[PDB]
Amino acid sequence: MLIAFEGIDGSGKTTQAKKLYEYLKQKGYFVSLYREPGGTKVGEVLREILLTEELDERTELLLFEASRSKLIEEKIIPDLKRDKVVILDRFVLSTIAYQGYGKGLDVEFIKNLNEFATRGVKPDITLLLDIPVDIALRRLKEKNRFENKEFLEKVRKGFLELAKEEENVVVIDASGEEEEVFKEILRALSGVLR
Amino acid sequence: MLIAFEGIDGSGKTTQAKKLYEYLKQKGYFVSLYREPGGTKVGEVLREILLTEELDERTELLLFEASRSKLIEEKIIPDLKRDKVVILDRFVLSTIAYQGYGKGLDVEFIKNLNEFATRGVKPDITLLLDIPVDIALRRLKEKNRFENKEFLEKVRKGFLELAKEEENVVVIDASGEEEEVFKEILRALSGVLRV
Numbered sequence: 296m297l298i299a300f301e302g303i304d305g306s307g308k309t310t311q312a313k314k315l316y317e318y319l320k321q322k323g324y325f326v327s328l329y330r331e332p333g334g335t336k337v338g339e340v341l342r343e344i345l346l347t348e349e350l351d352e353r354t355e356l357l358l359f360e361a362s363r364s365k366l367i368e369e370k371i372i373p374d375l376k377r378d379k380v381v382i383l384d385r386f387v388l389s390t391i392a393y394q395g396y397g398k399g400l401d402v403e404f405i406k407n408l409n410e411f412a413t414r415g416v417k418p419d420i421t422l423l424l425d426i427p428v429d430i431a432l433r434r435l436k437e438k439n440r441f442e443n444k445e446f447l448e449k450v451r452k453g454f455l456e457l458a459k460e461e462e463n464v465v466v467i468d469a470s471g472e473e474e475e476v477f478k479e480i481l482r483a484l485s486g487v488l489r
Numbered sequence: 490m491l492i493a494f495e496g497i498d499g500s501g502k503t504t505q506a507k508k509l510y511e512y513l514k515q516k517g518y519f520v521s522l523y524r525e526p527g528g529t530k531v532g533e534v535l536r537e538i539l540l541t542e543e544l545d546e547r548t549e550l551l552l553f554e555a556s557r558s559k560l561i562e563e564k565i566i567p568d569l570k571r572d573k574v575v576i577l578d579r580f581v582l583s584t585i586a587y588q589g590y591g592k593g594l595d596v597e598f599i600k601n602l603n604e605f606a607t608r609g610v611k612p613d614i615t616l617l618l619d620i621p622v623d624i625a626l627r628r629l630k631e632k633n634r635f636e637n638k639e640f641l642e643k644v645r646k647g648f649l650e651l652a653k654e655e656e657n658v659v660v661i662d663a664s665g666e667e668e669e670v671f672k673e674i675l676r677a678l679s680g681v682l683r684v
């Protein structure tokens with residue numbers, strides 16, 4: 296049971312994933328929650344680079360994938376082996392939507408890099424938190440280098456294209472308050488998980 | 490003009506690349522010299538990760554490629570534009586020989602990633618410093634995780650096969666004395682550059 300949250304910055308992924316985490320632990324699941332990029336010692340070094348340094352788009356791509364690879368080997372595959380429910384705050388669709396649809400790198404190439412880093416590990420469900428860009432940006436404080444309107448409109452569109460084309464992606468209206476969104480996540484999750 | 494040095498650990502790449510830097514400077518070229526992994530601030534942090542951490546082979550490949558991508562975009566392409574001769578202490582054949590022949594990852598995939606990271610930039614000449622593994626390892630004072638006989642015998646063989654398959658690779662016998670090996674380098678280079 297691998298549950299991924301996806302969506303643009305300010306869709307509320309981190310808030311929603313921590314809520315789901317604690318809710319499942321309550322219900323007696325064994326649960327893990329990891330962020331991408333990050334989630335391992337090495338991945339957190341890479342996250343810092345990715346967030347702080349001026350990178351070209353090809354370097355950035357390779358470092359998002361390196362973070363993922365480490366997280367898959369070190370944490371995700373061993374957790375799934377142990378019947379831990381694993382919740383991911385971003386996963387493979389983020390790389391396609393940001394570095395592909397956003398930055399213009401080839402989506403088909405990114406897919407193959409994704410499969411390489413993941414060893415083909417796929418979520419049981421992906422919750423795409425969809426929200427208009429203006430709404431999302433208004434939730435944020437400081438803007439990171441990805442959190443700009445022109446760019447995020449392309450990213451939002453790319454996620455919605457992926458939801459049509461990729462498997463097991465459910466589109467969640469994330470424009471509501473925290474609990475209405477959380478209830479929509481639980482309704483979508485009841486489709487794969489008690 | 491892009492010149493790459495390749496070969497197993499202890500073949501003398503770093504020693505020879507710096508000799509060549511000094512030689513070309515004395516001839517009035519503008520010259521750059523970079524190591525892989527490393528060569529940029531970002532790259533040098535990746536290098537540290539690569540040497541110090543236990544990494545799975547896939548993460549390792551991707552970090553080697555990320556270091557290369559950074560070096561290509563930040564340093565190598567701007568330098569080639571300025572007519573600097575660029576000398577590399579390791580480049581794309583290292584990744585094929587180490588991660589492909591040594592670690593067993595798919596060579597075609599590695600080549601695909603190499604092309605991505607380099608934007609198709611290729612050396613004018615690659616000097617493969619060939620040497621028996623036992624000779625090479627005896628030159629080294631401390632061993633990193635790659636500097637293992639079992640592993641390097643696979644890698645040495647992979648380099649020698651690449652020197653047949655790839656373009657513009659010249660095999661240099663690197664078991665000799667430093668100056669001798671340097672002379673053989675210069676003779677090879679004279680094919681592609683005024684020495």
Ligand SMILES: Nc1ncnc2c1ncn2[C@@H]1O[C@H](COP(=O)(O)OP(=O)(O)CP(=O)(O)O)[C@@H](O)[C@H]1O
Nearest residue numbers: 303304305306307308309310311434471472473476
């Ligand atoms: N439904 C909702 N309505 C209003 N504000 C919300 C909200 N869900 C979360 N927020 C607030 O929006 C801000 C961003 O939330 P969060 O950190 O969950 O988003 P995110 O993870 O999508 C940003 P990123 O993609 O850059 O990491 C936080 O202040 C959070 O409290």
Ligand SMILES: Nc1ncnc2c1ncn2[C@@H]1O[C@H](COP(=O)(O)OP(=O)(O)CP(=O)(O)O)[C@@H](O)[C@H]1O
Nearest residue numbers: 497498499500501502503504505628629665666667
């Ligand atoms: N031709 C030669 N004969 C004997 N010793 C040599 C030599 N060339 C270099 N050495 C010595 O061997 C050691 C390793 O040299 P060097 O650092 O150039 O190799 P290298 O760059 O192939 C190792 P690595 O691949 O791990 O970076 C140094 O002590 C160096 O002085």
Ligand SMILES: Cc1cn([C@H]2C[C@H](O)[C@@H](COP(=O)(O)O)O2)c(=O)[nH]c1=O
Nearest residue numbers: 304330331332359385389390393439441
């Ligand atoms: C995982 C991932 C994140 N990102 C961006 C989105 C965020 O703005 C930033 C940090 O994301 P995070 O805080 O959700 O981990 O990285 C990519 O550009 N590509 C990726 O593959």
Ligand SMILES: Cc1cn([C@H]2C[C@H](O)[C@@H](COP(=O)(O)O)O2)c(=O)[nH]c1=O
Nearest residue numbers: 498524525526553579583584587588635
């Ligand atoms: C560039 C490169 C180096 N390496 C290894 C060889 C060395 O043992 C180690 C450090 O290289 P360096 O000191 O020659 O720069 O990295 C690879 O495995 N793959 C690569 O693509």
Ligand SMILES: [Cl-]
Nearest residue numbers: 387406409410
């Ligand atoms: Cl994918």
Ligand SMILES: [Mg+2]
Nearest residue numbers: 308309310384
């Ligand atoms: Mg977040």
Ligand SMILES: [Mg+2]
Nearest residue numbers: 427428429451
């Ligand atoms: Mg919008």
Ligand SMILES: [Mg+2]
Nearest residue numbers: 502503504578
């Ligand atoms: Mg060296």
Ligand SMILES: [Mg+2]
Nearest residue numbers: 518519572574
């Ligand atoms: Mg010059």
